């Protein structure tokens, strides 16, 4: 499974109706995927690990993108995940600040790849929820929990280093 | 593998291209370091090897076995008639090294000096420096020359004196003189420049250049031996008597 920016889907599925149980139960997952094809694939993966159910003897009765409920309010997100290193597998709890749930999960994927060299096929996201400010554990979010927060932008590195490529004056980094 | 017995290096690699010298005189290649606190003086001289003899002196070396006893030591005799300063060259130091800024020669340069300037004095018309001493005796040339002196004073860092030996006082067949740049040390550039132009066209004795019982350096060209093999040239071990294609390899 590759990436991009992720979307959250809810995928609801069931086993196929045999003439023993004419109404098999429905199951629902929240799945963070680049698109709905990857969403259905990851659904069948997870539900096959959990229940004895395969894509052949089953169906997707619904696969639909969950939109962000409040995409203009900055939320804290707690991610409960498991992954596996080159050695055995580990449980983990991360915290992020974002506007969207899928944005925070994408942030978690790039962060796990950065800090633990973990690939997306190694990561399994098992819980994601919206944390308030007073329930957070990580200092990288609790330092932004301040109502009168204030900081400068100290060392502004020039970015247009090629427009111009040859100038006569050296750039300034204080602004 | 493993030459099985240690022996040091035959000969020195700090001395090779082991070729004929490109000069006959002997270039200084390093003069003494300048400090302007000293008086103005010269730093080198040009002599001729006469021969060797030996002496007897009494040694004053406390703790040594030859203390207050007489020894015999070999000496070398170098004939050094006074050298005539006839020119002066100035150098400026650049980030590419040290380049010659301006030379000034004197009026009435001698014939052995001009002999140095010619490769065949017999067939020549002996015309060297005639138009130069013209500008020395002139007055428009004279203000040009002092302007060159003043420019040398305000820009140069190293001045040297061009002096020749006077071969008419020597028992040698050679009448052609030897010229040499001798660095002037110990002063400001203005001070050493007026000192050198005072000494211009003039004789300088080895009594004034050197002194009694000081230690100096001798620069020269080693006695010539021609094309030699490795046994004479590098002092490698001779091969045993029953060696087919030669022993001295």
């Amino acid at each position: 499974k590759a990436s991009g920016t992720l979307r959250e889907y809810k995928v609801v599925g069931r086993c196929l109706p045999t003439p023993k149980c004419h109404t098999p139960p429905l199951y629902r997952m929240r799945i963070f995927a680049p698109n709905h094809v990857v969403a259905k694939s990851r659904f069948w993966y997870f539900v096959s690990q959990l229940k004895k159910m395969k894509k052949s003897s089953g169906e997707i009765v619904y696969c639909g993108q969950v939109f962000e409920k409040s995409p203009l309010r900055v939320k804290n997100f707690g991610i409960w995940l498991r992954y596996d290193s080159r050695s055995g597998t580990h449980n983990m709890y991360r915290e992020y600040r974002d506007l969207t749930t899928a944005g925070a999960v994408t942030q978690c994927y790039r962060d796990m790849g950065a800090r633990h060299r973990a690939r997306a096929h190694s990561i399994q996201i098992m819980k994601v929820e919206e944390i308030a400010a007073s329930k957070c554990r990580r200092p990288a979010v609790k330092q932004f929990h301040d109502s009168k927060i204030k900081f400068p932008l100290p060392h502004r590195v020039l970015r247009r280093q090629h427009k111009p490529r040859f100038t006569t004056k050296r750039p300034n980094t204080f602004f | 593998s493993h030459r099985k017995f240690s022996a040091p290096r035959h000969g020195s690699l700090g001395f090779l291209p082991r070729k004929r010298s490109s000069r006959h005189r002997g270039k200084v290649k390093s003069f003494p370091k300048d400090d302007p606190s000293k008086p103005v003086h010269l730093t080198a001289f040009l002599g001729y090897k006469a021969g060797m003899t030996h002496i007897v002196r009494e040694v004053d070396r406390p703790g040594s076995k030859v203390n207050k006893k007489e020894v015999v030591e070999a000496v070398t005799i170098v004939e050094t008639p006074p050298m005539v300063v006839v020119g002066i060259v100035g150098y400026v130091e650049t980030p590419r090294g040290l380049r010659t800024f301006k030379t000034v020669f004197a009026e009435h340069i001698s014939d052995e000096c001009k002999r140095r300037f010619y490769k065949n004095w017999h067939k020549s018309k002996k015309k060297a420096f005639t138009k130069y001493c013209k500008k020395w005796q002139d007055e428009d040339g004279k203000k040009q020359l002092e302007k060159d002196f003043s420019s040398m004073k305000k820009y140069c860092q190293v001045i040297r004196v061009i002096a020749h030996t006077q071969m008419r006082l020597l028992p040698l067949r050679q009448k052609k003189a030897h010229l040499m740049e001798i660095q002037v040390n110990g002063g400001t550039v203005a001070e050493k420049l007026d000192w050198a132009r005072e000494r211009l066209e003039q004789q300088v004795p080895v009594n004034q250049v050197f002194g009694q019982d000081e230690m100096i350096d001798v620069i020269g060209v080693t006695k010539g031996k021609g094309y030699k093999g490795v046994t004479s040239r590098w002092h490698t071990k001779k091969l045993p008597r029953k060696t087919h294609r030669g022993l001295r390899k």
Binding site: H155, V157, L158, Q161, H162, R165, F166, T167, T168, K169, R170, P171, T173 | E93, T94, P95, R96, G97
Partner: protein, 201 residues
């Protein structure tokens, strides 16, 4: 652009400046790079010195006179980096290598010209400020360059002359401002034309 491009090496990173110079000099563009003793290299001075001493160790052991030539001047070190980035075994690369010229300090066809700056190779732009760097002049002097004191004194002379010229230029600019304040009443008709089309805020 048919004129020579004159760059100031002080404050620039070696390989980045070399890459910019190499592409320019392949595209044409006679380039002079002055003050190659002010070029910076990232990484600390010791490991840069060790890299140079390993380069000094590289030697054709049959004939070191034939072997790789370890140039010591900072100008020639920069020139050899651009040589490494050029295709110098071809006539095109040799023509570009001839189109480039490098100097230690600023010699006097170029001390009275405007020097340009390449911000994509500047140390303040390309390095984090909490990182060690080295100076090409100090590195060259400790691997065997002879002429960093004479270059320093000549640069001090050049800086004094540049200060004098800059004070002249400032007096001229003050006079020009005074002249605008004097005859503004006869250029008010022309000034408003320029303000209308975006010159003269």
């Amino acid at each position: 652009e048919v004129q020579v491009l004159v760059l100031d090496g002080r404050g620039h990173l070696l390989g980045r400046l070399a890459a910019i110079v190499a592409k320019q000099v392949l595209l044409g563009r006679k380039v002079v790079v002055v003050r190659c003793e002010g070029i910076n290299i990232s990484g600390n001075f010791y490991r840069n010195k060790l890299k140079y001493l390993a380069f000094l160790r590289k030697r054709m052991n049959t004939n070191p006179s034939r072997g790789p030539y370890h140039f010591r001047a900072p100008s020639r070190i920069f020139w050899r980096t651009v040589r490494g980035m050029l295709p110098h075994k071809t006539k095109r690369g040799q023509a570009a290598l001839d189109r480039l010229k490098v100097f230690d300090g600023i010699p006097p066809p170029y001390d009275k010209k405007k020097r340009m700056v390449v911000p994509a190779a500047l140390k303040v732009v390309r390095l984090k400020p909490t990182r060690k760097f080295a100076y090409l002049g100090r590195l060259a002097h400790e691997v065997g360059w002879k002429y960093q004191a004479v270059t320093a004194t000549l640069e001090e002379k050049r800086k004094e002359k540049a200060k004098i010229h800059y004070r002249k230029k400032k007096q001229l600019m003050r006079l020009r401002k005074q002249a605008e304040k004097n005859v503004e009443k006869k250029i008010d008709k022309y000034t408003e034309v320029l303000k209308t089309h975006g010159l003269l805020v």
